[model samples]
Target: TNTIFKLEGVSVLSPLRKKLDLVFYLSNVDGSPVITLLKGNDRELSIYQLNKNIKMASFLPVPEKPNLIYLFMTYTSCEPVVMTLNKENTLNQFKNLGLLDSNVTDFEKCVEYIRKQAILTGFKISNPFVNSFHLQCHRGTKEGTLYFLPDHIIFGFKKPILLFDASDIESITYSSITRLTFNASLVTKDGEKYEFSMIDQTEYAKIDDYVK
Candidate 1:
């Protein structure tokens, strides 16, 4: 008698950033997510399976963009699906769904709330302007944000978002150190390497502790 779970007017980035409806089918009495579907005016665009783990069933709020809010859902066995939320309707239901606390309204609180909920670690020193650390590779001029979750390290809001599972990593090497900044490299169990540079000197301790 209550609901099948639905959100209207979502702007999806990969099913082409088009307008769509977000719908989820829950279980009998618990109302837990079994699967979620993105429906277009013409038809359903996609369906994603949900899980209990926050890593798999994550509800992440995109940082910045206070003018309008962004949030993404990670359903296991697939990449995340990003979307925009309406403060009046979508956000109102988002809070009440129990995935987030009632007081989380803005981007700052949203990030703070998620860190408290899922991240295994954080740093005291960070970019004064943003909640995430800067990331780049291959001498590329473009940059993106790096996020640390308990089970994964994610770099994104870019063309190719880099997400590494904790189990997939064999080592986290601070690879370089200088007066200005430090460089970090990741070695995966399969012998793949990823190097990211330009971390503030102040974050060394916190990043090191987590790495160790």
Candidate 2:
């Protein structure tokens, strides 16, 4: 099957609730439903059902580490789509030529994949503060190591300039990293960098005294 896969710890989100507005329920391996509900982020309501058929995976103590699997299906796009982290915790969008996927299926799974692809498998920013000091980029292929700092001139000395260097992206693991098989372009954005107009190749941030 063409099912996509993702890895996660034992329990990622809070438990689910019943007769409540918000909740999370995990279907156990045995085809049973396990439910845990809470009043809010601060309070755990109470264990209601605890049926033998259902298992509360999230409640089970997630060892220091646990193996999790997430899955997704491919989407059709007009341009290259880059999935990136908005911050340490969230994914804002999967963008391509300023186009975004309205329906993001397999939410947490896809998010975990992007996180691992960029940070775990590829050249991750070990220390965002120091490692991101330089804004580097490239195009065409490996032949040209030349990097252009668009943000460099845009925000000269006033602030720091950060860029996305795709060359640094070696592998996506789940999909073929090469071939460009189906009229598609690889789109990537720096989740660390501020989000802005992806369509505008020019008109960069005109922060005062930042650019020379």
Candidate 3:
């Protein structure tokens, strides 16, 4: 009973099929509040020891919106983790970092949290349905949901979850334009390629709007 935020069998998709039972507990390390993961019974991941240790963290709807709670938190020198919440009760735990607050959308809170470190969020590029576009990201022949953030592109709810800074793009080009769907690719200045595909043709109008 150490004030843990318990999450049940949470579904994740880091470009693969995944789920886990998670317990986020706060305890002291060097007399400072340190967060550690309790994955069922294993407890060894030391995180947030520096108060602002997270490189950037975000939460969004996976395939639905307005009430979903999937999250991904990246770090500068630590293992990044991603998980979905079973209930909203898990949020108060993050209040310690001022990452989640009342009277605001969780997405907005996440944006504010990331912006606290010089990042920006939310733009005019939402999908036709008036929601931010969350498309399928294909990795190793697996489909992951890549998010369309105003300043970054992120993929997965499951291991290979990734966030790409919009500034790092050399070019974003489409691929194999077939009937019903198409593929888009992202190439960075370093010659790395990220292919996201199986996009519905109905999204074509919104697709080209930001595929620069």
Candidate 4:
């Protein structure tokens, strides 16, 4: 006996809401591999083992055009599965599964995946930073790293990362006994002050010049 899974609330650009019916067809009587067929025409969608590791999967419609949506599925140890659908409301059906807009491209998908993973892992920055500086400080008696980006300043050690936009900075100043050690302070437009100590004088000057 075969089992059928019916999807609901699937609607694309069309005004009508449609459903996608999926039926499981066993390729071998021994139940070795499984193939999924679209209900009416028995069109083969994709094949998979019962125990495959799927890292990410999405079914979305083509961006501006309404008819078709491509499927992107990544696995743990095998090549990714890429396919397209041309059914009337197939795009909307996949949207019901929480996939992104049909217009999303492969590159967009890769970036989205990386961003999600970075946020989840919570260890390092997923996107590149323009500059990074190690702050030798004892704030709450803890050392920290400050990342400088084109538009923001991110400072933190672990979770709860802090971000201050470049536009918010009103002024920056630094003072030191010599080139090896200094204290850097930045004042925001709202009069909020952020102070740091024990930084290389050369780097502090660089930051000061950059901010100005």
Which residue pairs clash within candidate 1? 12-17
Worst 10 residues of 1 by lDDT: 119-128
Rank candidates, lDDT, best first: 3, 1, 4, 2
lDDT of 3: 0.57
* Selected candidate, larger TM-score, 1 vs 3: 3
Local distance difference test, each candidate: 0.55, 0.24, 0.57, 0.47
Instruction: For candidate 4, write residues 1-212 as lDDT tens digits.
Output: 44312333222221112343343334355543333434355543444552344444433334344454444344454313434445444444444545446665344443354245323432122333214333334233466556565566755433333457889999877765565777778789999887777776666665876698
The segments of candidate 4 whose C-alpha lies over 4 angstroms from its true place after superposition are 1-126, 130-140, 158-160
Over 125-147, each residue of candidate 1 has an lDDT whose tens digit, in order, gives 12123422323333245566666
Each prediction's TM-score against the native?
A: 0.61, 0.16, 0.65, 0.38
Candidate whose lDDT is highest: 3
TM-score of 4: 0.38
**How many clashing residue pairs, candidate 2?**
9
What clash count does candidate 4 reach? Answer: 2
Best by TM-score: 3
Badly placed stretches (over 4 Å) of model 2 are: 1-112, 125-205
Q: With candidate 3 superimposed using the best TM-score fit, by how many Å does residue 25's alpha carbon deviate from the native?
A: 6.0
lDDT score for residue 35 of model 3: 40
